[PDB]
Amino acid sequence: DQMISHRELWAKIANSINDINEYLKVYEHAVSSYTQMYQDFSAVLSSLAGWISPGGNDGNSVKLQVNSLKKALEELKEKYKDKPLYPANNTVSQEQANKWLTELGGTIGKVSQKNGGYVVSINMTPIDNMLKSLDNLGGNGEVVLDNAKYQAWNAGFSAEDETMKNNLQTLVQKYSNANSIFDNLVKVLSSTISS
Amino acid sequence: DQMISHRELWAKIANSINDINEYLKVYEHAVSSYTQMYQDFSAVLSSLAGWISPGGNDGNSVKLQVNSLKKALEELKEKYKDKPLYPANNTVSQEQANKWLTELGGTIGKVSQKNGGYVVSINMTPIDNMLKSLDNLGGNGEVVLDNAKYQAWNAGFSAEDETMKNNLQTLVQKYSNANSIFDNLVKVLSSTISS
Ligand SMILES: C[C@H](CCC(=O)O)[C@H]1CC[C@H]2[C@@H]3CC[C@@H]4C[C@H](O)CC[C@]4(C)[C@H]3C[C@H](O)[C@]12C
Ligand SMILES: C[C@H](CCC(=O)O)[C@H]1CC[C@H]2[C@@H]3CC[C@@H]4C[C@H](O)CC[C@]4(C)[C@H]3C[C@H](O)[C@]12C
């Protein structure tokens, strides 16, 4: 083709730098949103010790304060109902949301609707699973479980905690890799047209 | 400012592709070389299950084939004494091997001399630590260890295993990231050529 000027060359690069920055900011916001939710959830698990007391007359059953635990988990759900993983502002097409959902992890997000568009919500399945487990315990707002049943339910609570913690570390790793790839790509690209 | 032609822009991008390609070729041999080492060590790992057996008069202690394990580790160390991470063949400067040891991390390699020149050998210190820990167990071909002694020894053995495992994954992750830099640089070149 013809010639390209220095100004249009660097205008293309400045525009590409902005496009790369917006791409990396998607990972950064997804990490920050999921981190805040996991921190909120971890405070619920550490509060569990204060929501249980001796149950049977032998004293080796466990009385679970089910209404306290569900209220804490339900407030968790409502807090993040309108805090999507992507995008941080406004909405995108359903197809664009589906692509970013696969890019981040199918079990970490979930596509939902907003303002006539679509977003990638935080997948609340770990929270829904424990709200479901608590309702299957029955009871009068307070349930008395035998020791074997409490340890079984407690282990399921800790398994959901581990799933979310591993999801976060996976997302943190994807962000760190994307960061170093595109930080160095910009450094390479800037270095080689400057000289 | 000065105007550049499309062809000169292609050549600028192309020489960066060639620069990264030279970097990738050296980095790839270090990955395959260290992968082969850890794969051979995992062959020693799978044979360790058959080298421990009940050894107490009550069955409470652990009987370890310390000589078979020691000999297997020394053969692993001797197999890779002349197989360096860099260069793939011949030698290199002390300056050159020094900086390529820094680019590879410094933990996975060690600069050594080979007939006037220098190489970046595989750092076998995790294997040497295992050998001194085994030597500390004593015995004569086979040792009987109480449960406490076996668990302490196994924890140290596990830590050196995890050292090599983590060494490999950091190496693989950096190789993958540099490959993605290459791929995106190729996307840039392909786009500017078609434009
Ligand atoms: C995939 C993301 C966009 C993700 C999104 O939809 O928001 C885009 C945004 C910025 C994009 C890059 C912009 C610079 C480069 C432009 C080239 O012509 C093609 C490769 C590069 C390196 C792009 C690669 C990549 O296509 C990127 C990273
Ligand atoms: C820092 C990144 C790798 C990021 C990572 O995965 O850790 C590395 C990977 C490829 C590296 C380049 C390889 C080619 C060049 C080798 C030179 O001797 C030093 C500058 C160059 C241009 C390197 C620059 C940079 O050091 C790079 C981009």
Residue numbers in the entry:
A (entry chain B), B (entry chain A): 126 to 147, 149 to 321
What does the paper say about this structure?
Like many Gram-negative pathogens, Shigella rely on their type three secretion system (T3SS) to inject effector proteins into eukaryotic host cells, driving both cellular invasion and evasion of host immune responses. Studies in Shigella have demonstrated that bile salts found in the small intestine (e.g., deoxycholate (DOC)) interact directly with the injectisome tip complex protein invasion plasmid antigen D (IpaD) to support interaction with the hydrophobic translocator protein IpaB and its stable recruitment to the maturing tip complex. In Shigella, IpaD resides at the extracellular tip of the injectisome where it functions as a “gatekeeper” that prevents unwanted protein secretion (leakage) through the injectisome prior to requisite activation events. Here, we uncover critical mechanistic details of the Shigella-specific DOC signaling process by describing the role of a π-helix secondary structure element within the T3SS tip protein invasion plasmid antigen D (IpaD).
X-ray crystal structures of DOC-bound IpaDWT and DOC-bound IpaDΔQ148 were critical for resolving this apparent conflict by providing the first molecular insight into the role of IpaD’s π-helix in the DOC-mediated Shigella virulence enhancement pathway. More specifically, comparing these structures shows that eliminating the π-helix does not eliminate DOC binding, but instead causes the single binding site for DOC to migrate approximately 10 Å, now docking in the cleft between the two central helices where the elimination of the π-helix occurred. A single DOC molecule is also located between the same central helices of IpaD Δ1–121, ΔQ148; however, the binding location of the DOC moved distally nearly 10 Å compared to the IpaDWT binding site, now interacting with the region of the protein where the π-helix once was. A closer look at the side chains located within 4.5 Å of the bound DOCs shows that while some polar and charged side chains such as lysine 137 and serine 141 in the native binding site and aspartate 144 and serine 141 in the modified site of the π-helix deletion construct are in the vicinity of the DOC binding sites, they are oriented away from the bound DOC and do not appear to contribute to binding through electrostatic interactions. Instead, both DOC interactions are driven nearly exclusively through hydrophobic interactions. We first looked within the native (lower) DOC binding site for structural clues as to why it migrated with the elimination of the π-helix and found that the deletion of the π-helix results in a subtle, but noticeable, 15° rotation of the N-terminal helix away from the C-terminal helix. This rotation likely reduces the affinity of DOC to this site as several hydrophobic side chains previously shown to support DOC binding are included in the rotation, but understanding the observed binding site migration also requires consideration of the alternate (distal) binding site that is formed with the loss of the π-helix.
